[PDB]
Amino acid sequence: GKRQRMVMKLESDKTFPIMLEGKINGYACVVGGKLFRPMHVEGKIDNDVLAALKTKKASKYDLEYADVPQNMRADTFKYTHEKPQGYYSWHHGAVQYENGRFTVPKGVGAKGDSGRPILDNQGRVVAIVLGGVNEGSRTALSVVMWNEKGVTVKYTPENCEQW
Amino acid sequence: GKRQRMVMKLESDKTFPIMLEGKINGYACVVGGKLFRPMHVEGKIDNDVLAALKTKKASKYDLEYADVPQNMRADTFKYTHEKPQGYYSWHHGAVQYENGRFTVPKGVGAKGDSGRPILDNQGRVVAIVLGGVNEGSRTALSVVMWNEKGVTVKYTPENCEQW
Amino acid sequence: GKRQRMVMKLESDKTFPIMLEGKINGYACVVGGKLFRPMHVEGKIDNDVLAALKTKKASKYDLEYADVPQNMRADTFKYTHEKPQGYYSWHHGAVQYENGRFTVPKGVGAKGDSGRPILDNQGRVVAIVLGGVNEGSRTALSVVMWNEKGVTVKYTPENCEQW
Amino acid sequence: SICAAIATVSVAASTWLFCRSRVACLTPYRLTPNARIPFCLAVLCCAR
């Protein structure tokens, strides 16, 4: 359609895939001046600038996270605490937000789908996908996100799969 | 012409290459619920399911074999033992079966094309290419095959070079 | 325009890249029955014949050399010692030879283009590019060359960066 | 001591040759994609 193309224009600049030996295992996000990388994804970030940086780990929230260099700080994503119900954007089409649960119509979402930033109707990141489970005819996701206080909140449904 | 297209259509999903630091050195075979893979070709399996298994070894026959799970046994190659003499289909064209010996015309044959199965006019695997030896104008193959009894026979000419 | 096409036509078969997990970091040179290859470029030779040899080392002159077999000595580069000042052909265009020094205009030059030989208007190798240093607007090269007596002279400016 | 060493070497070598012959029996029959074992070579070599 139309929504995915501006998301591709954003992801071509700041979302960086990881390099497993032949394929892509996950996607490093650069948001607010702090590089994010999921743990179960293992490989090398494509940039030689973002590869050399040693990451601190947070095992409760399943994310390595280091600080981005000073030149890269203006060319980062933006983050939003406030999310109303409705429709948000994603690389694979659209994502529904209902009762605090990012859900996706099924058939999409598999291995190599990790760290993709869920955007909004303005271009700001509201969540980061780490995996999900097939809730019948529509799959839900297991994302980390942010709230009004400045506290990273992870939601995870029952028996999710580390994508 | 169309024979290579039929080989690419039959061996599209069932043939997985072997990677070694980006180099393609061999090809495994998924047939009968079994994963055939040679000894001298060393590397990682490009498929994620077939790589996380344990392959029983046979150094005399030059074959590693494993157990394909039940959700993939329908999407395998076919096999048979009834073979007449004459012509058969191969990835680089045709192959002659004369006096129980597989012969390939020259010009083709290097290091890397090991493990390609030999097909027929119906679509069944009759042999697995393991090595080759240059004989005058027309090279001979060192392969494996089956018989009516059910004994895997390894045919090897004199002074072969492993591919 | 046509100079890069002449470089691609002369250096088509005789130039072999060096692979390191899929990355091209250097280029060897086959000239005079010898295989020149630097120290800092580490990886596997893309050619199968040149990789299965043993290269004698020279860390002071920054060169590994070997013996090309007799069936390939006719398909090598040419080499000479008679060089005047002025212009010469290089893979990215032209190179100036002034006061016994090779200079390249800026804009080009990164990590990976090490080992490219410098050609002339006739087709003979006069130097081998090993390193470069940024000097104002016009960079200088740290190379090796020969002389009338037969002594391999390594020219190295101040504070060079290895490519 | 020497009789126990001779008996030990003989029993170990005979067991080694038995395992070698069992592998040599069952190696052609396991590489086949049909994965069947005939009647005589199943029980006599503990193939199952």
Swiss-Prot record, chain D:
Lineage: Viruses, Riboviria, Orthornavirae, Kitrinoviricota, Alsuviricetes
Segments passing through the bilayer: 1-17
Lipid-binding residues (covalent, S-palmitoyl cysteine): C25, C45, C46
Stretches of the chain found on the membrane's Cytoplasmic side: 18-48
Species of provenance: Venezuelan equine encephalitis virus (strain TC-83)
Top-rank lineage group of the source organism: Viruses
Protein localization: Virion membrane; Host cell membrane
Coiled coil region boundaries: none
Entire protein: shown range: 706 to 753 of 1254
Physiological role: Plays a role in viral attachment to target host cell, by binding to the cell receptor LDLRAD3. Synthesized as a p62 precursor which is processed by furin at the cell membrane just before virion budding, giving rise to E2-E1 heterodimer. The p62-E1 heterodimer is stable, whereas E2-E1 is unstable and dissociate at low pH. p62 is processed at the last step, presumably to avoid E1 fusion activation before its final export to cell surface.
Protein name in the entry: Spike glycoprotein E2
